[PDB]
Design a protein around this ligand. Structure first.
Ligand SMILES: [Cl-]
Lengths: 8, 150, 150, 8
């Protein structure tokens, strides 16, 4: 998801 | 401002509750996100804190956590003196408000790097504790406690 | 054995996973219960740890956490050097094994005081860190870090 | 429940 905690 | 004194503080964001413990003498913080501020949540958070730092006294954040027998049980277990959080020194209300405003500002600065608020809050804890204002709060707390042990 | 070196360690109880970080020079620990070891859980735990202590290097507990891009992203974010956990010094294997056995012993001793395993594990962290062996691991970690700041 | 985390 483009987040540190959800790279997807 | 002894090495063992901590203050609880509870603030809200995104419909969730951020519980914070402040080491008064240094301004170092630990924090977590919980759905609501119950005696069981507050008790578990104090058990976590007291296993990590030498917590002698906690000033509770409100009268429900002061009254809660679950919080009193955790403070008994971990050897903490549970106290009220009355601002006999009016400087206290102001310091806590200013910290909540600072944390919320930091959380805003990172919020788009994290899907979950709990990630953002722990990024904000890290930035607060490492900020040089000159020493950081993380440096001050270690200095204070090491001085006390020695 | 420098002030900023930590070792990750994952052990199992009650069909759940306990993730532990060990400050190698002092033997101080932080730990949490998670339902299974994933890169996302491990990454969040490291972000928590690095906001609370000056974490320079982490030796990961296995090759899946070393490879995990989520764990590498958290170590980038927090300024941690991610390293493998190969026991080049065979003593490391034994030290970790016997810590897991000590923690599980302690958890047994408290387990009847807590409904949930996560309470028991945090009781065990508190007992481990406060045990005098003479200084405790919580005293040794503050001494070491303060000595480094100075 | 007679437990520190669940006094009931
Ligand atoms: Cl697993």
């Amino acid at each position: 998801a483009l987040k540190i905690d959800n790279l997807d | 401002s002894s090495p063992g004194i901590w203050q609880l503080d509870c603030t809200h964001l995104e419909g969730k509750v951020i519980l914070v413990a402040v080491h008064v003498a240094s301004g170092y913080i630990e924090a977590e996100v919980i759905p609501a501020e119950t005696g069981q949540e507050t008790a578990y958070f104090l058990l976590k804190l007291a296993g990590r730092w030498p917590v002698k006294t906690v000033h509770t954040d409100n009268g429900s956590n002061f009254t809660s027998t679950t919080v009193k049980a955790a403070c008994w277990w971990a050897g903490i003196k549970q106290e009220d959080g009355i601002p006999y020194n009016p400087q206290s209300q102001g310091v806590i408000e200013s910290m909540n405003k600072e944390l919320k500002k930091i959380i805003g600065q990172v919020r788009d790097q994290a899907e979950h608020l709990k990630t953002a809050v722990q990024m904000a804890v890290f930035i607060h504790n490492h900020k040089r204002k000159g020493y950081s709060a993380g440096e001050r707390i270690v200095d204070i406690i090491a001085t006390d042990i020695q």
